[PDB]
Paper text:
The structural characterization of CkTcS identified key residues around the substrate binding pocket that are critical for N9-methyltransferse activity. A previous study using 14C labeled caffeine has confirmed that theacrine is biosynthesized from caffeine, possibly initiated by oxidation at C8 to yield the intermediate 1,3,7-trimethyluric acid followed by N9-methylation.
To explain the substrate specificity of CkTcS, we determined the crystal structure of CkTcS in complex with 1,3,7-trimethyluric acid, in the presence of S-adenosyl-L-homocysteine (SAH), a byproduct of the cofactor SAM, at a resolution of 3.14 Å. The major structural difference between the coffee and CkTcS N-methyltransferases occurs on a helix (residues 236-255 in CkTcS), which contributes to the formation of the substrate binding pocket. The 1,3,7-trimethyluric acid is enveloped in the active site through both hydrogen bonding and van der Waals interactions, with N-9 approximate to the thioether moiety of SAH. Particularly, the hydroxyl group of Thr-31 forms hydrogen bonds with both N-9 and O-8. The Thr-31-O-8 hydrogen bond may stabilize the O-8 carbonyl group in an iminol tautomeric state, which could facilitate attack of SAM for N9-methylation.
Residue numbers in the entry:
A (entry chain B): 9 to 122, 127 to 167, 175 to 369
B (entry chain C): 9 to 92, 95 to 118, 130 to 173, 175 to 369
Write the structure that this text describes.
């Protein structure tokens, strides 16, 4: 399951790295959260000797992951100047599933090194649902749009005819995802529990929703639209529907209260600061519906192609996303509901 | 060179991972050297608490780097029980362009991480390493040795390494460079290894103490002729074979010592040499056993050579290589001398 989850490898031509415009803005909207978090590590005083270990979980191949490395070093070098002490060292651990194209990210990481603080970038392949780093190895943890991806799909059963929680899917389809996120998030939080230094800090950003029920269009339109495009191909006979009935995507966008309660029960890290914000799903600067759709199709296909192609096949991929782009521009007039995101800042209690 | 050096990236059939034939034997001989060093770290006692950091500097995409990790972890498993809750952190280090995807594809308490970059510079935080390993990686320079230019034409015309048909300065030139680059490796590593930490490094060198001995440099010699013959055919430019010199050096046992002596940070617990057959030689067909030697040569020299002559004429080059090895020498070459060197931070 984690053996086939990742984003478009390479390159970048219509891959993940080229189509990372939206997610870069989420980091931009949550950059101060990191900046404050770095300052707290300096207020801790204990982390000033001798080296500070930070890590980004779920870095893909895209240009977003060294954005935060830049802010961490910049902020660190700034407070390094106030302390008037050139001893600060920084080791950064970039984490993603094995299937990820590290060479593309490495080639990207190769350019930005090459200065008060030295920076050491290491790559850590593997799932973050288990333990990745030795005990008390991390002062700071950062994660953007990677937490919501589940360990496994929630569990002749059926979620007809969708790949996700919808208005057309009652009722354990909503409940399973809820308990499943609790299942996966707990592993994550608990695996971190032994990984982060006491009084450490944590900054998590994931895609969620403000609605009480996730079947609302704003919450689940990506999967609802994907579910339509695959279903229409079944009408054409290109794909068998019983595969669509069976396939549901291992991912989940939760509400803030659900997310809080998830962190509360496991009293490892107290919630320093939580917040929910909605960005315009796509820009929206183009008056051409095809332009808005294509830019949004290529970015949606970018982070969904490998996980979907596993179930439906490499070959038919091109036709599905073309049908998906079409119903966005023509059927939906290049207009989509807002996209909620959740800034989640924690600090280990032990 | 740091940008354009990597082993053959991929997974078959010319990839270095499929061509680990020779190196897996060297790792076997240095396994006891590795076995002991891992145990001396336990003798250092302080390393019991709390987690031990190991680093392989030069792991390619081949499976040989897992061979080193497996024994660190397995040896520790026995040491902990007698001592009665441990953790190991292994860093895989290599240049960029290294098929870490292939590396990590072959990959899948012990937590391993990938560290891209040269070991001629800083790679790890200060006082963070207890044990460091590097097999057949250190003898690569960061550049063609200085002093092969210009004077103002020149100089190793027409070969790619130290040979008989060459001015006396090339022996000094290659020894000059290696000294400089190795110091930086020792200099950089001097500030990462914990005090009384351990460092086990493996490279190949000469036993003849003369750089131009056929035994010591047959690989580059057999290549140099292989390139040269294809030059006569007009297939490859002539000036290129002359100007280009390979960024690698095979030091003597005594020459290694000085380098380590000059830089007082590391002391020598042990240092030895062992010569292995360049090929087996357990096979009867020369034309079908020299190819395996030809394949593994192509596994680590294709990218560094394709860079200067283009990948366009590569296939014909190693075709002559195999021909030279299997016809001229009748599939018989001098043994490859390998060097085990065990060090400790003098702090
Ligand atoms: N269980 C898991 N363990 C480790 N990484 C995971 C994971 N589930 C999803 N991911 C990774 O999380 C990534 C989200 S895309 C990365 C988001 C952001 N643009 C950035 O560059 O940081 C994907 O590459 C995916 O491989
Ligand atoms: N100067 C250097 N710094 C880091 N790795 C190097 C190096 N020179 C060679 N290597 C690596 O060591 C490995 C030897 S196998 C090769 O894959 C090569 O990429
Ligand atoms: C659910 N979700 C998105 O919606 C999204 C992602 N990156 C984008 O740019 N978008 C829009 N990823 C990574 C994802 O997980
Ligand atoms: C110079 N040189 C070799 O000659 C060699 C290597 N691997 C082997 O199997 N051989 C023989 N490597 C890694 C190397 O750099």
């Amino acid at each position: 399951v984690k053996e086939v989850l990742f984003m478009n490898t390479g390159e970048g031509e219509s891959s993940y790295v080229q189509n990372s415009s939206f997610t870069e803005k989420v980091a931009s909207m949550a950059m101060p959260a990191l900046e404050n978090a770095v300052e707290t590590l300096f207020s801790k005083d204990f982390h000033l000797f001798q080296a500070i270990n930070a890590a980004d979980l779920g870095c893909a191949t895209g240009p977003n992951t060294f954005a935060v490395i830049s802010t961490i070093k910049r902020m660190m070098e700034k407070k390094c100047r106030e302390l008037n002490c050139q001893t600060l060292e920084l080791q950064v651990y970039m984490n993603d599933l094995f299937g990820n194209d590290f060479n593309t990210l490495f080639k990207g990481l190769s350019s930005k090194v090459i200065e008060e603080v030295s920076c050491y970038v290491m790559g850590v392949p593997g799932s973050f649902h288990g333990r990745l780093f030795p005990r008390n190895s991390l002062h700071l943890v950062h994660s953007s749009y990677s937490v919501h991806w589940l360990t496994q799909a929630p569990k002749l059963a059926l979620n007809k005819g969708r790949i996700y929680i919808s208005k057309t899917s009652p009722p354990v389809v909503r409940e399973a995802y809820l308990s499943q996120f609790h299942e996966d998030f707990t592993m994550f939080l608990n695996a971190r529990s032994q990984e982060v230094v006491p009084n450490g800090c944590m900054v998590l950003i994931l895609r969620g929703r403000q609605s009480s029920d996730p079947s609302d269009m704003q919450s689940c339109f990506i999967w609802e639209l994907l579910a339509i495009a695959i279903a229409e191909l079944v009408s054409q006979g290109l794909i068998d529907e019983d595969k669509l009935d069976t396939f549901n995507i291992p991912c989940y966008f939760p509400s803030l209260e659900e997310v809080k309660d998830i962190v509360e029960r496991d009293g490892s890290f107290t919630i320093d600061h939580m917040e929910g914000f909605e960005l315009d799903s796509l820009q929206m600067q183009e008056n051409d519906k095809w332009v808005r759709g294509e830019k949004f199709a290529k970015i949606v296909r970018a982070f969904t192609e490998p996980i979907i192609s596993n179930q439906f096949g490499h070959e038919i991929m091109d036709k599905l996303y073309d049908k998906f782009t079409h119903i966005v521009v023509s059927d939906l007039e290049a207009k989509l509901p807002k996209t909620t995101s959740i800034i989640l800042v924690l600090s280990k209690i032990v």
